[PDB]
Symmetry: D2
Subunit: 298 residues, 4 copies
């Protein structure tokens, strides 16, 4: 109850790159202000959506500082500092601390098969480098490849320093089990395509990549469920999933950046290689989506 300021809808911030795949500091600032203007509660910087695992530590630090300049004091700031290496993760956590972030986050170290105790000592070290700001633990069985148990999840979110769990799992039975076991836990829905259902299962918020282009739709699902308007929440989720269908067809990250480009937010919609660029045949649909979303705002 002492870290209640971490609840809400927070876009997983994309990292804009230039024509040579270097950070586009100018576009990054505009994206932070664009999200603030959507009414989001916070911003999740340097995550998987931010293409952190194709950036260097110095680059991820560069992004963390720019976002903190634009957003500190305006919306909640969460820095994803996770690496495979515990020392590299500690470097980013100390940096987030220096920049004034409200919390840090770390994906379960992946690739190599680490024991559960190793995962805990990994979070304990990062939490120490965070030097007093809460940790948002991860439970992503899909991409990371770490299948956990309820009692393991219960041990993670009880570590001294953990103040939230980012639940990137479609298993809403486990979502309900987590909520039932930890009534006060800040619990982010990680899959935008089941946002409405994730909230009903126990989540009290979300962190998603598609929030960068239509965060108001997800804010509206929250409003609808609070109001008892299940039909409105369903219709909103249908629309979000029409978009996600398109983003899956064309590439989620590059598709979102392309929409933000046609929205005149990002100057370059590139992802870093080996992400290929968007195919020409998809450009017409993505531009029309931008016009739809911009007219839908006001």
């Amino acid at each position: 109850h002492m870290v209640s300021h971490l609840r809400g809808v927070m876009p997983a911030l994309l990292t804009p790159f230039d024509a040579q795949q270097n950070i586009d500091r100018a576009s990054l600032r505009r994206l932070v202000r664009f999200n603030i203007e959507q009414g989001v509660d916070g911003v999740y910087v340097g995550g998987s959506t931010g293409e952190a695992f194709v950036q260097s530590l110095s680059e991820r630090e560069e992004v963390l500082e720019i976002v903190a300049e634009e957003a500190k004091g305006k919306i909640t700031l969460i820095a994803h500092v996770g690496c495979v290496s515990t020392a590299e993760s500690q470097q980013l956590a100390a940096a987030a601390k220096r920049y004034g972030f409200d919390a840090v986050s770390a994906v379960t170290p992946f690739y190599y098969p680490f024991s559960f105790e190793e995962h805990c000592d990994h979070y304990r070290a990062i939490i120490d480098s965070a030097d007093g700001i809460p940790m948002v633990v991860y439970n992503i069985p899909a991409l990371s490849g770490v299948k956990l148990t309820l009692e393991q999840i219960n041990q993670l979110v009880t570590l001294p320093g953990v103040g939230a769990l980012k639940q990137t799992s479609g298993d809403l039975y486990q979502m309900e089990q987590i909520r039932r076991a930890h009534p006060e836990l800040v619990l982010y829905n990680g899959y935008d395509e089941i946002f409405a259902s994730g909230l009903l299962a126990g989540a009290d918020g979300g962190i998603g990549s598609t929030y960068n282009i239509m965060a108001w739709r997800y804010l509206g699902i929250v409003q609808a469920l609070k109001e008892g308007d299940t039909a409105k929440a369903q219709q909103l989720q249908h629309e979000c999933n029409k978009v996600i269908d398109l983003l899956v067809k064309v590439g989620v990250f590059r598709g979102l950046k392309t929409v933000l480009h046609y929205m005149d937010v990002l100057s370059v919609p590139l992802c870093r290689k080996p992400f290929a660029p968007v195919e020409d045949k998809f450009q017409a649909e993505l531009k029309a989506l931008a016009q739809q979303l911009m007219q839908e705002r006001g």
Copy 2:
């Protein structure tokens, strides 16, 4: 034209006696018990009914008994699915003779069959059903058949198919199916995500835990219709508490034990290789029964 198939329908358990033979007397009382709960229908002879440890003659016996007890009072759905298409046809013809409202068949399992072979499998059963609608399966877990949206479209649009039993925890696919087929009858398969399943697109449910607490699931439906999301969450919590226990003791045998302490079933045995419930769990299961009975009224 098949809106009479929507609703909450328990996946019926098949009661056995001390020697693991069908307990006809307890089977009739179980049907009565579910009818007295307010269910919209009953799903007979499914995986919950231990159909794949019974004979064709035994599954027909259960079908005929349930039809006698329920036909004309609630919707009757007969799971006629086997691996063999011919065996599945035999039970479809029997359900048609017994006056069932619909048939159902699990995707042929164990052997790897092509999608075309699945569709022909259903066509053969739809033919022996002889005018009653078919409920198809999308169960990627136990059966081991991972499908695609376009493949789901071809199944639900087969002439004769009238509903889809969605036994999947992926509520993105649930939504995609509802978006593609607004009028489709869509059963949520996993009771533990029932409330989320409805919100994702399901308009009903077929579950094994309905046998002991159908009113909770019927309550979730009402709560979401009335816009009482808080109430729906509370009910799903209580359902998932029970499911936590049933998973610990054994789902089917735990349900039968609760029904035994409810004085519905005389013998809560499942058929071997299912072991019986451990003695150390009997106290909790009896306490659960007493709780559900007092909660009823």
Copy 3:
């Protein structure tokens, strides 16, 4: 003291007729065809035998005929496995009356059964087998039962177990089992890694492809004993050229089609939902039959 179970033993196909009834005459011809190939035994009523689309009466009949044709001439192994323990026992007692040298039971599948429930399942079947040895299964793929080395030790050391049918491509586990059980009879399940499976610890195999080319697998066994690792490799190449084709056309139905062109089977049909072979593959399958026939003599 059960070393007579080691060797190459074809997994027997179950021939059917035009109306998908059991073809008793083609069955006898197949048993005689395999005995001419020089196999060490026959594995009856298995997954290759399409046991799970047959009735208990049908499987008992196939067991009895194979016994009439082969008893006293080659080793007889009866797969009696069913999901139901009682059903498995009935077939176990039947194989005992028919004089089979051993029985086998796939790990009960579909439903999630504890490892202890698997062991009791095997105990019950071994008791009904009344003194003939049991062959256990470690088939993680089709059955869906992922086991542990220690669990494998408990199974193969059960009173009555005399062999293990290892249907797993994990040849690390194959080596661990041999290292832990130097005298255990150990069959390689996947024919496409037969040579590598033997080198990892297996002392035999049970394969569906042995029905059309057992001599190649018998030659691999001989090549490895002689030290001609080149011959074993080339023999495995040829077996996998064929397995490549069978995977493309359908393994069971493709094997029967070859046997049909060999004049062994009258109808190369499997039972629905298995579809028949596409006409476009008939030329290739016939050309393989002539190659295999000319190859032998």
Copy 4:
């Protein structure tokens, strides 16, 4: 014209100091130790080398040190693989400057990239390699990239590819790759099936356990060429007893610990979050080191 890339090559470990910085002195001694074992080459900066907890600058430091010690003495292969293509190109250009005989890149992981995106990734590295052959991966396990035979046939025919590191236990695919590409340089990835992997088609190996007992694997290669299948099995048995121990304690840290008790590495630490070896395992790991040292003289 890439036959010089065949043979047994240890996946070099990266020694660290008490402060987990690179231990240059122990690295050089490890390269000399492998060279003294009779290996055909060294695989530097791979998964075994803990490349994914190091920095680009650190991996370059290792590549250059090894090239100083080994160039002109054994084949040098630098694993330049990163998720990022640009980062992989930087290390590929550095391997070119240091005179490596070939580069290698694991399939980019974590993010789901299309197969075409994988090829352009490899194409880009081959260009920065500036003329030295590429070794592509087929590792479906850790990386999470399940490929197809035709996709494998496209990767190993890319201009610049000269070998394939087959890190898969599926020895059916191994034989298929060998049959489709008779001349391909093909490394067996899993040490626990090395003998069976060679028999299936592989003509070499890249393994982490080679750092402490390469002569056993070099002996398996000799035993098979000699036709002494019995000896090959015995060697693989002994190798798998070690691997059983290494799995229990942690493969990388266990290998480094054995190398520490061999007075090769001064510090057996892996980088966090890898924990150190537990004290209760030290006695065994020291006994293993003593066994291996007496074994080779």
